[PDB]
Design a protein around this ligand. Sequence first.
Ligand SMILES: O=c1ccn([C@H]2C[C@H](O)[C@@H](COP(=O)(O)O)O2)c(=O)[nH]1
Ligand SMILES: O=c1ccn([C@H]2C[C@H](O)[C@@H](COP(=O)(O)O)O2)c(=O)[nH]1
Ligand SMILES: O=c1ccn([C@H]2C[C@H](O)[C@@H](COP(=O)(O)O)O2)c(=O)[nH]1
Ligand SMILES: [Mg+2]
Ligand SMILES: [Mg+2]
Lengths: 167, 167, 167
Amino acid sequence: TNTLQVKLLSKNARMPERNHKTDAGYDIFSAETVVLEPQEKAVIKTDVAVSIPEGYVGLLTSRSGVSSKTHLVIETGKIDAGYHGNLGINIKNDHEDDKMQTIFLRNIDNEKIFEKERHLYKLGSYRIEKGERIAQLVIVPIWTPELKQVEEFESVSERGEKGFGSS
Amino acid sequence: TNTLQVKLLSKNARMPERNHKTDAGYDIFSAETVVLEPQEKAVIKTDVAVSIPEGYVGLLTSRSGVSSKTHLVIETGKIDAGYHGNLGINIKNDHEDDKMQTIFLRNIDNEKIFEKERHLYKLGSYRIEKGERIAQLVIVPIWTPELKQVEEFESVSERGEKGFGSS
Amino acid sequence: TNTLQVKLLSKNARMPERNHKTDAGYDIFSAETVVLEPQEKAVIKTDVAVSIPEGYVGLLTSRSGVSSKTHLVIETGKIDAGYHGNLGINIKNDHEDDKMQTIFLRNIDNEKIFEKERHLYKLGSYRIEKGERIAQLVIVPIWTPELKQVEEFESVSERGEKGFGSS
Ligand SMILES: O=c1ccn([C@H]2C[C@H](O)[C@@H](COP(=O)(O)O)O2)c(=O)[nH]1
Ligand SMILES: O=c1ccn([C@H]2C[C@H](O)[C@@H](COP(=O)(O)O)O2)c(=O)[nH]1
Ligand SMILES: O=c1ccn([C@H]2C[C@H](O)[C@@H](COP(=O)(O)O)O2)c(=O)[nH]1
Ligand SMILES: [Mg+2]
Ligand SMILES: [Mg+2]
């Protein structure tokens, strides 16, 4: 009732963790090491399942550090109540593909990764390490009413049909 | 009270549909056939209006299939209580514009569209078909208090001024 | 209790404003003038602090006008209850870097900015002016339960492990 069921699907999974006791979200960790080149897309596995109860939705979203410092973009996942599969981090390296080469991959803090064994990478490539903190899960109540088709609404609003307005 | 008013604005509109009875969102369908080239932006019409009541906001957001499989990016629309206009899907084909040509448009499952009448397209172009399911609407309660300007807050938090932290 | 504490951190700050009395969000204004070139990223300062109470999260998100009309992309910030720092607008000019030059910067309505003193800019560059309305803050209640690790969930759902489905 004030409890959320969490299922760890492999040895690579980490239990989600809340930094401060009043923060919104539970930190989410990668269960896989992946390199993403510029423009490359992936669904990164967490090997974590949850059982969000009816009346709620999970928002599987970015962290402020990773999104602001790198070109790694996470599309917010709407995690349905009842979904018991592996939580997937839906991600793109949105660094441009400019055809330049470099010796340095970048980590999720945008720091150059110095390797003893030197290799050539596409400029703007990132490595995500297993066990790194790349997303968070925030759970929010939802309203799911019956839909009633109408020809006209039962009240006239101040806003009306106005949208996509200027600044 | 557990009812949402929905107004269909044309013959091309489809009534929004919830897949599972505990899912968060109502599937939203395009009322238009559009081709989007790489980097092209549009507001796609649903020809659907709704009357979200005070105390709530609608989140007009992506589906997991379309966002993960294509370069089609939907910016989450915050649908105001009282807004009675046509719901617009705010979208970009974020495929890079690399100047390559192809015979194949892609659908929203990222499958090549085979045509009897062959044409040249920009590589990374998508067609969205009228009646296709490209977004969803999730409704969430909101807190809208009066704002009280202060010189200092009435409590000291654990978090304090910390933000945009590392991993 | 129906009150939100707001702290103005400088003379460049503006008090957040709700357009209609039933709208979801409080408009948020830039405290800085910045030019963003294609692919450039920034955290734009508002010089505004807030004290979101426990049980809520702030969503610092785009406006419909700016996102639909420009290539300026704002990543939704999850503003923690207790965070008392300067609200940062996490932004990218996602206009492609095509190496073309122009005399015209664009404003956030995507209008060309005519200058008496003519200068060369990168095509797709935007200027954000201090005091312009570029984001909004929507506050939403959250559920933050204790996590209970399990080997199997206490109910079988209709959805099950299904996710990232087709259209
Ligand atoms: O970023 C995401 C988005 C969705 N899902 C899963 C959980 C959702 O309940 C399910 C939705 O799938 P469709 O309804 O789009 O098929 O996919 C994820 O794991 N991560
Ligand atoms: O993706 C979106 C975003 C907004 N709107 C509409 C409904 C909102 O209430 C209204 C907000 O317009 P402004 O307040 O930004 O002018 O625009 C949409 O239809 N789709
Ligand atoms: O777009 C954003 C995202 C986050 N934050 C601040 C407020 C949050 O509480 C804090 C989170 O920082 P980390 O927990 O990611 O370190 O950063 C912003 O000001 N703007
Ligand atoms: Mg891009
Ligand atoms: Mg979002």
